[PDB]
Design a protein around this nucleic acid. Structure first.
Ligand SMILES: [Mg+2]
Ligand SMILES: [Mg+2]
Ligand SMILES: [Mg+2]
Ligand SMILES: [Mg+2]
Ligand SMILES: [Mg+2]
Ligand SMILES: [Mg+2]
Ligand SMILES: [Mg+2]
Ligand SMILES: [Mg+2]
Ligand SMILES: [Mg+2]
Ligand SMILES: [Mg+2]
Ligand SMILES: [Mg+2]
Ligand SMILES: [Mg+2]
Ligand SMILES: [Mg+2]
Ligand SMILES: [Mg+2]
Lengths: 49, 104, 185
RNA sequence: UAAUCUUAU
RNA sequence: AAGUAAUUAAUAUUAGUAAAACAAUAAGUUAUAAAUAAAUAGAAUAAUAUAUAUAUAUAAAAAAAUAUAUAUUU
RNA sequence: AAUUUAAUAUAACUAUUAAUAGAAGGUUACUAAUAAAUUAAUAAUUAAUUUUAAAACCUAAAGGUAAACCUUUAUAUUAAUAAUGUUAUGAAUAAUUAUUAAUAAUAAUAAACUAAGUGAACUGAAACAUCUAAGUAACUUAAGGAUAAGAAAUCAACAGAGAUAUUAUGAGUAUUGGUGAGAGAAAAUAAUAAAGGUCUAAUAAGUAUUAUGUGAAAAAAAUGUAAGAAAAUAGGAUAACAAAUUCUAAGACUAAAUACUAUUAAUAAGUAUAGUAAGUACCGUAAGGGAA
């Protein structure tokens, strides 16, 4: 038989559930494009110098 | 641009995926529950009032920063001000010489 | 500190048994009463399986003289028999403890509290006995918190009718069997 | 003497 | 039925390359400078030691020791 | 058409490399059998995949026992019916047979490799006592196909790296030793290697640290006894202190290169006394030894 969860463990579980419920940070296409453009600019600058 | 982004090293790419640059993360230590909580800083948990260790441990953070420096993608990473690490030319310039060097 | 002599221990990984699968050759008679303790049961200082030793195993080392003539000695922990009060169980529980463990108990403010601390370190330095004690306490706490309603009679009412129905078809039906049938329902 | 410990039922 | 093998070090002979060799991914080992416990020292100011370098000593020499120099570096 | 040479077998072991995978003995008998399906490709077929029958007794752990035997009673109850004969007053009580439903059972399981516990001595030091042999042999326990380790309270040195494992150089260098016998790193650079990072923790206290007793020949992290902190404004790291630097313990997961066994393939300046029998004959009360 599985051992029951103590108070602290339950509270931690609840916190984890709350965290999951919130909207997750996800890397957008736009952000990637912005990064990629900046990388390209950096490469161009390196080539120049 | 997308292809150039993809060509970035793996660790850096992974970091960008899981802590994206749209969110302006805090310079100072924050609540662990916060959305803008910096993964490089030790954030305090609001209930227990204990400082959690940084989500990216210090070595990993340093590696990520060096990768960003290499590919010119520093400002898209969250700030490393209040983490005590400086890097390369900035570190060289900003540092005070040791007491032993200046005053033997 | 570390818990090397505890967390080194490995136990045979039991395969998860599906309801429709074939039996193992040796199935036990009486069922498992307690949960499985992650770190098994100590196979060295078996003295400590019976008590709350706080992960304090016997050391072996060297008696060394003025001549540096090394001779093997052992260093036992300061074990002590101690009947300490459980608030949850409403009885005092007598066990072997290290003096260190007794000190920790005193610091934490009770024996139940010591048992139920959620940290992994505590779990490691609980014994199998300590794990069983913890389970007993935790289960009791859960019962106190949450009584069943906050069904048996209905079952008792239906049972004789069910038996009669069975008899009318042709077969006899015993309670235990009825209980077994209508556990999940 | 509800520190400890020994015995008997 | 009895001087064998492995990992090393020092000599010798030959063969390859040679002020370089082995290796070529870099790194390393040996050589190319002698000393000194060690240190920030180290080889003709106008030539053979009568000069120079180092260690002792010293203002700098001398003094003991070893090493370095007389078209081409060994 | 035959002969020869080289290679290949159900039919050798050994070493290496590569690839793949993690596996029944005995005893004597009322002897311990099998049946099928689907799918290609040339009705029978061979091959692949799947299902299915039987299978005694012994091999610690149903209960015994002097292994291959004995005793338990699943060709059992308990109940419900049906058929039969007897007892006492259509109904009741026991027995036998035949259906239906309900109730439990079968450890022969590797060895090597791994981790943990305890831990010698001969021996070396030309003696021997610290030291060595050596955390070796051995015994004991526990796991998995591997285990262990592993994403820095790590190294380094003001420049930097940026997980663990194995090997080469570093280097027999630093280091250490009755400064004897002898023992001996790390950084760094290369390979091998896999996608190698990633949260699972409400961020860790009788914990760090201290005293003391022990503790891998150098280099600690451990540990019995007892005192015992701090919040990132902090904490760990070096005799010590000051500066600086670096990392975040007391919560976790992890392929891969590796070890061992077996199989298959290939290569043998290997074996015919390292070439298949036999762990037999025989020796011993026994553990055990062991032929031709
Ligand atoms: Mg002088
Ligand atoms: Mg048996
Ligand atoms: Mg008898
Ligand atoms: Mg061992
Ligand atoms: Mg001797
Ligand atoms: Mg003698
Ligand atoms: Mg030793
Ligand atoms: Mg593992
Ligand atoms: Mg050794
Ligand atoms: Mg922590
Ligand atoms: Mg912490
Ligand atoms: Mg100590
Ligand atoms: Mg940590
Ligand atoms: Mg692990």
């Amino acid at each position: 038989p599985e051992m029951p969860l103590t108070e602290v463990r339950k509270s931690h579980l609840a916190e984890k559930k709350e965290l999951a419920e919130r909207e997750v940070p996800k890397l957008t296409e736009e952000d990637m494009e912005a990064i990629g453009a900046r990388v390209f600019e950096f490469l161009e600058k390196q080539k120049r110098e | 641009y997308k292809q150039y982004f993809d060509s970035l090293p793996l660790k850096l790419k992974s970091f960008f995926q899981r802590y994206p640059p749209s969110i302006k993360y805090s310079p100072v230590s924050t609540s662990t529950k916060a959305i803008n909580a910096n993964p490089f800083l030790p954030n305090k948990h609001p209930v227990t009032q204990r400082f959690h260790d940084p989500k990216y441990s210090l070595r990993r953070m340093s590696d990520v920063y060096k990768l960003a420096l290499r590919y010119g993608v520093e400002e898209f990473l969250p700030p490393i001000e209040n983490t005590k690490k400086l890097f390369f030319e900035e570190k060289y310039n900003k540092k005070t010489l040791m007491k032993g060097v200046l005053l033997p | 500190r570390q818990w090397r002599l505890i967390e080194t221990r490995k136990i045979a990984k039991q395969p998860n048994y599906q309801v429709g699968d074939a039996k193992p050759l040796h199935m036990p008679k009486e069922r498992k009463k307690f949960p499985d303790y992650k770190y098994g049961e100590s196979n060295i200082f078996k003295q400590s399986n019976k008590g709350l030793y706080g992960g304090s195993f016997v050391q072996f080392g060297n008696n060394i003289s003025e001549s540096k003539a090394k001779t093997r000695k052992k260093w036992l922990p300061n074990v002590v028999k101690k009947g300490l009060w459980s608030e949850t169980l409403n009885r005092k529980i007598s066990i072997k403890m290290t003096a260190k463990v007794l000190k920790t108990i005193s610091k934490e403010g009770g024996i139940d509290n010591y048992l139920t601390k959620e940290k992994s370190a505590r779990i490691k330095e609980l014994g199998p006995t300590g794990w069983k004690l913890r389970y007993r306490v935790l289960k009791r706490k859960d019962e106190i918190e949450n009584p069943p309603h906050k069904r048996r009679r209905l079952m008792s009412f239906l049972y004789p009718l069910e038996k009669l129905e069975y008899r009318s078809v042709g077969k006899d039906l015993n309670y235990k069997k009825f209980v077994e049938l209508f556990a999940d329902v």
